[PDB]
Amino acid sequence: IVGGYTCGANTVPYQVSLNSGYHFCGGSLINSQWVVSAAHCYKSGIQVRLGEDNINVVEGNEQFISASKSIVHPSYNSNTLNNDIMLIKLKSAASLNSRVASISLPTSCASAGTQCLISGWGNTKSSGTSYPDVLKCLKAPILSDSSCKSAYPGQITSNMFCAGYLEGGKDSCQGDSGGPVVCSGKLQGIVSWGSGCAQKNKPGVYTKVCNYVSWIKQTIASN
Ligand SMILES: NC(=[NH2+])N1CCCCC1
Ligand SMILES: [Ca+2]
């Protein structure tokens, strides 16, 4: 996250870190046994880390649970990033408490102008590299579809939205991928792609979760 603030320990209780020996992507806990992340974060050998603040220090609220199954969306296209969503099942249920909690799926799609919270452990610089050890947060609005399409001609599908600031300076960045965009207490987006980080006229692009609720629910019910 570029241009954000330190969230505070366990203030974003649905945020997970995906670990394969190191943090590589975020995700969101949607019930005690399932996480949703970006398809472009797929790999084998995932451990899900819940209850994290500092990802390099054991602070006492963590739960570390291996994945048993990963399911990339049937129509994910790695060239265009259309349908950039995946589900991860945990080998055992997490223990839910005030610091480790699920986030609700939306019943309706959010409109442009709605303010959302984006979080992650990704790079904090737009030029160069500095990775934080504690969770960072950013408040940002959903942008109109017309502004999003004007920023990225030919690249925005109905399964994407833009959020952030056209003036630059505040955005998600490398290592934030897969993490949550929460608006009015519901999961509306997944950190997906962008051109650089925090550049003028190049806002972040997010997977539009409201289009996937039926697939999520049906997949969980049968796996
Ligand atoms: N919002 C961005 N600029 N991003 C998304 C995360 C990956 C790097 C590009
Ligand atoms: Ca920790």
Side-chain angles (χ1 to χ4, degrees), residues 51-60 62 64:
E52 287 282 20
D53 190 45
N54 191 315
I55 53 166
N56 279 320
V57 178
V58 172
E59 298 181 290
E62 299 91 345
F64 298 167

PDB file of all heavy atoms in Angstrom, residues 51-60 62 64, ligand 2:
ATOM      1  N   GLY A  51      -4.854 -13.739  11.778  1.00  0.00           N
ATOM      2  CA  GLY A  51      -4.527 -13.066  13.020  1.00  0.00           C
ATOM      3  C   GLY A  51      -3.197 -12.335  13.014  1.00  0.00           C
ATOM      4  O   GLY A  51      -2.682 -11.997  14.082  1.00  0.00           O
ATOM      5  N   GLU A  52      -2.649 -12.050  11.837  1.00  0.00           N
ATOM      6  CA  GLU A  52      -1.347 -11.419  11.725  1.00  0.00           C
ATOM      7  C   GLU A  52      -1.437  -9.902  11.833  1.00  0.00           C
ATOM      8  O   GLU A  52      -2.325  -9.263  11.281  1.00  0.00           O
ATOM      9  CB  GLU A  52      -0.713 -11.735  10.358  1.00  0.00           C
ATOM     10  CG  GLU A  52      -0.213 -13.170  10.217  1.00  0.00           C
ATOM     11  CD  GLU A  52       1.119 -13.404  10.903  1.00  0.00           C
ATOM     12  OE1 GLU A  52       1.463 -12.599  11.782  1.00  0.00           O
ATOM     13  OE2 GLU A  52       1.789 -14.394  10.563  1.00  0.00           O
ATOM     14  N   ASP A  53      -0.395  -9.332  12.454  1.00  0.00           N
ATOM     15  CA  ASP A  53      -0.044  -7.929  12.267  1.00  0.00           C
ATOM     16  C   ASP A  53       1.376  -7.878  11.712  1.00  0.00           C
ATOM     17  O   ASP A  53       1.557  -7.756  10.512  1.00  0.00           O
ATOM     18  CB  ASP A  53      -0.245  -7.046  13.501  1.00  0.00           C
ATOM     19  CG  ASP A  53      -0.090  -5.583  13.142  1.00  0.00           C
ATOM     20  OD1 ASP A  53      -0.660  -5.168  12.107  1.00  0.00           O
ATOM     21  OD2 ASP A  53       0.599  -4.859  13.892  1.00  0.00           O
ATOM     22  N   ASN A  54       2.387  -8.036  12.560  1.00  0.00           N
ATOM     23  CA  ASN A  54       3.752  -8.137  12.077  1.00  0.00           C
ATOM     24  C   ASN A  54       3.973  -9.555  11.551  1.00  0.00           C
ATOM     25  O   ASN A  54       3.918 -10.523  12.310  1.00  0.00           O
ATOM     26  CB  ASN A  54       4.739  -7.805  13.197  1.00  0.00           C
ATOM     27  CG  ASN A  54       6.137  -7.652  12.670  1.00  0.00           C
ATOM     28  OD1 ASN A  54       6.602  -8.457  11.875  1.00  0.00           O
ATOM     29  ND2 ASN A  54       6.824  -6.604  13.093  1.00  0.00           N
ATOM     30  N   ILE A  55       4.215  -9.685  10.250  1.00  0.00           N
ATOM     31  CA  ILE A  55       4.370 -11.002   9.620  1.00  0.00           C
ATOM     32  C   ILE A  55       5.717 -11.651   9.888  1.00  0.00           C
ATOM     33  O   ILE A  55       5.905 -12.814   9.524  1.00  0.00           O
ATOM     34  CB  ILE A  55       4.056 -10.970   8.116  1.00  0.00           C
ATOM     35  CG1 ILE A  55       4.858  -9.888   7.399  1.00  0.00           C
ATOM     36  CG2 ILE A  55       2.543 -10.827   7.927  1.00  0.00           C
ATOM     37  CD1 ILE A  55       4.844 -10.009   5.900  1.00  0.00           C
ATOM     38  N   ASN A  56       6.639 -10.948  10.561  1.00  0.00           N
ATOM     39  CA  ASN A  56       7.954 -11.473  10.905  1.00  0.00           C
ATOM     40  C   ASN A  56       8.136 -11.762  12.390  1.00  0.00           C
ATOM     41  O   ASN A  56       9.215 -12.206  12.772  1.00  0.00           O
ATOM     42  CB  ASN A  56       9.050 -10.526  10.427  1.00  0.00           C
ATOM     43  CG  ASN A  56       9.367 -10.705   8.963  1.00  0.00           C
ATOM     44  OD1 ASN A  56       9.406 -11.823   8.452  1.00  0.00           O
ATOM     45  ND2 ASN A  56       9.639  -9.607   8.288  1.00  0.00           N
ATOM     46  N   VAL A  57       7.126 -11.526  13.218  1.00  0.00           N
ATOM     47  CA  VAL A  57       7.211 -11.721  14.662  1.00  0.00           C
ATOM     48  C   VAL A  57       5.968 -12.468  15.107  1.00  0.00           C
ATOM     49  O   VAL A  57       4.862 -12.094  14.720  1.00  0.00           O
ATOM     50  CB  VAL A  57       7.296 -10.367  15.397  1.00  0.00           C
ATOM     51  CG1 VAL A  57       7.333 -10.562  16.914  1.00  0.00           C
ATOM     52  CG2 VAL A  57       8.495  -9.541  14.930  1.00  0.00           C
ATOM     53  N   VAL A  58       6.116 -13.473  15.955  1.00  0.00           N
ATOM     54  CA  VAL A  58       4.963 -14.150  16.551  1.00  0.00           C
ATOM     55  C   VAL A  58       4.504 -13.297  17.726  1.00  0.00           C
ATOM     56  O   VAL A  58       5.239 -13.129  18.706  1.00  0.00           O
ATOM     57  CB  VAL A  58       5.304 -15.581  16.982  1.00  0.00           C
ATOM     58  CG1 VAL A  58       4.160 -16.190  17.758  1.00  0.00           C
ATOM     59  CG2 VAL A  58       5.657 -16.407  15.756  1.00  0.00           C
ATOM     60  N   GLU A  59       3.305 -12.724  17.595  1.00  0.00           N
ATOM     61  CA  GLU A  59       2.765 -11.786  18.572  1.00  0.00           C
ATOM     62  C   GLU A  59       1.689 -12.374  19.465  1.00  0.00           C
ATOM     63  O   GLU A  59       1.394 -11.795  20.508  1.00  0.00           O
ATOM     64  CB  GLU A  59       2.268 -10.514  17.872  1.00  0.00           C
ATOM     65  CG  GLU A  59       3.398  -9.762  17.159  1.00  0.00           C
ATOM     66  CD  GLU A  59       2.950  -8.498  16.471  1.00  0.00           C
ATOM     67  OE1 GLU A  59       2.230  -8.571  15.454  1.00  0.00           O
ATOM     68  OE2 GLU A  59       3.312  -7.394  16.922  1.00  0.00           O
ATOM     69  N   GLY A  60       1.122 -13.513  19.097  1.00  0.00           N
ATOM     70  CA  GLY A  60       0.254 -14.277  19.977  1.00  0.00           C
ATOM     71  C   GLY A  60      -1.173 -14.475  19.520  1.00  0.00           C
ATOM     72  O   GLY A  60      -1.905 -15.218  20.181  1.00  0.00           O
ATOM     73  N   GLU A  62      -1.914 -15.310  16.162  1.00  0.00           N
ATOM     74  CA  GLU A  62      -1.881 -15.988  14.882  1.00  0.00           C
ATOM     75  C   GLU A  62      -2.524 -17.365  14.932  1.00  0.00           C
ATOM     76  O   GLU A  62      -2.485 -18.076  15.934  1.00  0.00           O
ATOM     77  CB  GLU A  62      -0.444 -16.196  14.430  1.00  0.00           C
ATOM     78  CG  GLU A  62       0.356 -14.918  14.221  1.00  0.00           C
ATOM     79  CD  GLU A  62       1.134 -14.421  15.431  1.00  0.00           C
ATOM     80  OE1 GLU A  62       0.892 -14.860  16.576  1.00  0.00           O
ATOM     81  OE2 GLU A  62       1.989 -13.538  15.190  1.00  0.00           O
ATOM     82  N   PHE A  64      -2.066 -20.535  12.038  1.00  0.00           N
ATOM     83  CA  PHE A  64      -1.413 -20.969  10.810  1.00  0.00           C
ATOM     84  C   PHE A  64      -2.065 -22.278  10.375  1.00  0.00           C
ATOM     85  O   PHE A  64      -1.998 -23.263  11.110  1.00  0.00           O
ATOM     86  CB  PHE A  64       0.086 -21.216  11.016  1.00  0.00           C
ATOM     87  CG  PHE A  64       0.928 -20.019  11.444  1.00  0.00           C
ATOM     88  CD1 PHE A  64       2.214 -20.260  11.897  1.00  0.00           C
ATOM     89  CD2 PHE A  64       0.515 -18.701  11.321  1.00  0.00           C
ATOM     90  CE1 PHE A  64       3.037 -19.214  12.267  1.00  0.00           C
ATOM     91  CE2 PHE A  64       1.350 -17.656  11.687  1.00  0.00           C
ATOM     92  CZ  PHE A  64       2.598 -17.917  12.162  1.00  0.00           C
TER      93      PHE A  64
HETATM   94 CA    CA B   2       2.949 -12.303  13.468  1.00  0.00          CA
END
